Amino acid sequence: AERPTLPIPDLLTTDARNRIQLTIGAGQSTFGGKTATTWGYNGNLLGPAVKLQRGKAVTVDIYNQLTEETTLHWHGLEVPGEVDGGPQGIIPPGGKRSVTLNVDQPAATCWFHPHQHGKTGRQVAMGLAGLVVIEDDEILKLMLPKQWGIDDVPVIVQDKKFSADGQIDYQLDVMTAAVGWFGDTLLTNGAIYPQHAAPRGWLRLRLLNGCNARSLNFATSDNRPLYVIASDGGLLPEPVKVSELPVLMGERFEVLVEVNDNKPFDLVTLPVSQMGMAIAPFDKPHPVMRIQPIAISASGALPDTLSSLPALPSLEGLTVRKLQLSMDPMLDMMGMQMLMEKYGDQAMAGMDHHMNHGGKFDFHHANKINGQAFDMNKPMFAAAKGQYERWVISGVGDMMLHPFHIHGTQFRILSENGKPPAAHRAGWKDTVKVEGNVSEVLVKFNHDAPKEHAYMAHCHLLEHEDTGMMLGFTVG
């Protein structure tokens, strides 16, 4: 049979009352011909792309039609804590919450997802994620590929696994609390190995790693390069040519790739050096989508310059914050042992060369920052507003992968896991790799966040977050 076409999320803008309506609900999807219960925003799975303009406010009405509580966070958007949608931003089942977003950051591809306390991994795994397209006056002048669903397309890449009855097989247990929830099936905007018909010339892909725990590494099947034009928080100063593009959980990159007549190619993901993630079929390059060239000229450009990136400022005298990530050694050892017993040596491929003892020993609070599993009631510190700070995040002490995300900002990486950042990671980022080593970022918070609606800082390996690897902080 033919490949399904790549689903394209609807690009949503405000009504005359300046409102966007998002309904959160459950329905059915089909994978490999089997029905599964799934959750979506304005539909059964995944979500729309909300279009925002810098300097304009919009109001979002969010209707929770689930039978459990949820929250809605705008990952990558710089907004006050009151509308950030972290764990404190509860929307009761059957209820509605509205937020007004005053967009004040450069053009970028952001996304939105639940942030329910202790349950974010399950709610994302069940289907909830959407996109945010921010535009500003600067990016349209570049004449990039811009026809949504034709030469400008979002690519949300996620793994799942399913039980024999067809349902999503999600569990937060001792194994996944240590190494993450991952599966054997790869979805691309919700579809298994779709094709996308693209015109001849440049194709813009807005890539999102929407996996709970799996890192990805994009490349093309015939080794044509990818031209990175933007990261999490917006355009790079100029395109950066790469042959492969690692993408951590929750990160976005936009790339341009050439489309030539008569030569279809796949976007693929290459095996990564992360525990658990190279089990067949991920032990080999895995297709993500087929690009099918169409003999119609694409009008988009790849300009030599994209934007102006300001210099880093002097670092002397800035507040330095230490964030020590950690995992309880016993539950790290027990979850890694369960991974190895289940899959054997292949669970470490590509890597470098039972009774109840009480609540003190519960894996649900085994992962921590600065010695503390996430306490919704006690922000760990008060950060300055309108001030640059240097945050130092260490994963020394274990070897798991921790893509560390800070709400309320787009930062600059100074050191990524002990090395200067790669050029395409040197611009605006909301995520930094921490793995066995130390990262340092330069952050500034432009908006307030009070104790009652604090900003989160956390590992974006969702099962780590849900079992304590998160802190709250206030601003202002």
# of chain residues touching Cu ion (CB under 5 A): 8
461 in contact with Cu ion (CB under 5 A): yes
Token digits of residue 46: 């995944």
Q: Is 211 annotated as a binding residue?
A: no
Which residue's C-beta sits nearest to Cu ion? 459
Q: Is 286 annotated as a binding residue?
A: no
Q: Is 407 annotated as a binding residue?
A: yes
Q: Nearest distance from residue 395's CB to Cu ion, in Å?
A: 7
What is the CA angle 413-119-40, rounded to 5?
90
Report helix, strand and coil shares of the chain as percent, to nearest 5.
10, 40, 45
Token digits of residue 321: 């914050």
Looking at the Cβ atoms of 188 and 212, the one nearer to Cu ion is 212
Q: What are the residues facing 297 on neighbouring strands?
A: 200
Out of 75, 206, 368, 425, the residue judged to bind Cu ion by CB under 5 A: 75
The beta-strand segments (E) located in 216-346 are 216-220, 226-231, 234-242, 245-247, 252-259, 265-269, 286-297, 320-327
Looking at the Cβ atoms of 160 and 402, the one nearer to Cu ion is 402
Q: Nearest distance from residue 253's CB to Cu ion, in Å?
A: 16
Looking at the Cβ atoms of 206 and 402, the one nearer to Cu ion is 402
Alpha carbon distance 226, 218 (integer Å): 9
Q: Is 424 annotated as a binding residue?
A: no
Looking at the Cβ atoms of 145 and 234, the one nearer to Cu ion is 234
Q: Nearest distance from residue 125's CB to Cu ion, in Å?
A: 14
Looking at the Cβ atoms of 250 and 472, the one nearer to Cu ion is 250
Out of 157, 334, 459, 471, the residue judged to bind Cu ion by CB under 5 A: 459
464 in contact with Cu ion (CB under 5 A): yes
- Residues near 333 by beta carbon (within 8 Å), at least 6 away in sequence: none
Alpha carbon distance 128, 148 (integer Å): 21
Q: Is 365 annotated as a binding residue?
A: no
Footprint of Cu ion on 379-438 (CB under 5 A): 402, 407
Q: Nearest distance from residue 249's CB to Cu ion, in Å?
A: 9
Region near Cu ion per CB under 5 A, out of 48-56, 95-103, 138-146, 247-255: 247-255
Q: Nearest distance from residue 460's CB to Cu ion, in Å?
A: 6
Alpha carbon distance 11, 240 (integer Å): 27
Looking at the Cβ atoms of 254 and 398, the one nearer to Cu ion is 398
Q: Is 73 annotated as a binding residue?
A: yes
Region near Cu ion per CB under 5 A, out of 75-83, 123-131, 133-141, 264-272: 75-83
Alpha carbon distance 77, 115 (integer Å): 14
441 in contact with Cu ion (CB under 5 A): no
Listed residue (98, 56, 105) closest to 79, CA to CA: 105
Region near Cu ion per CB under 5 A, out of 4-12, 262-270, 348-356, 462-470: 462-470
Token digits of residue 398: 């274990």
The beta-strand segments (E) located in 85-213 are 96-102, 108-113, 130-135, 152-160, 185-188, 195-209
252 in contact with Cu ion (CB under 5 A): no
Looking at the Cβ atoms of 86 and 145, the one nearer to Cu ion is 86
Looking at the Cβ atoms of 73 and 290, the one nearer to Cu ion is 73
Token digits of residue 249: 């959980």
Region near Cu ion per CB under 5 A, out of 11-19, 139-147, 160-168, 449-457: 449-457
Q: Nearest distance from residue 266's CB to Cu ion, in Å?
A: 28
- Residues near 15 by beta carbon (within 8 Å), at least 6 away in sequence: none
The beta-strand segments (E) located in 42-148 are 49-53, 57-64, 73-75, 96-102, 108-113, 130-135
- Residues near 191 by beta carbon (within 8 Å), at least 6 away in sequence: 4, 6, 7
Cα-Cα-Cα-Cα torsion 144, 146, 149, 154, nearest 10 degrees, comes to 60
Listed residue (108, 41, 42) closest to 73, CA to CA: 41
349 in contact with Cu ion (CB under 5 A): no
Q: Nearest distance from residue 121's CB to Cu ion, in Å?
A: 12
How many Cβ atoms are within 10 Å of 36's Cβ, its own excluded?
A: 22
Annotated binding site for Cu cation: 73, 75, 113, 115, 402, 405, 407, 458-460, 464
Which residues are near Cu ion by CB under 5 A? Answer: 75, 250, 402, 407, 456, 459, 461, 464
Annotated binding site: 73, 75, 113, 115, 402, 405, 407, 458-460, 464
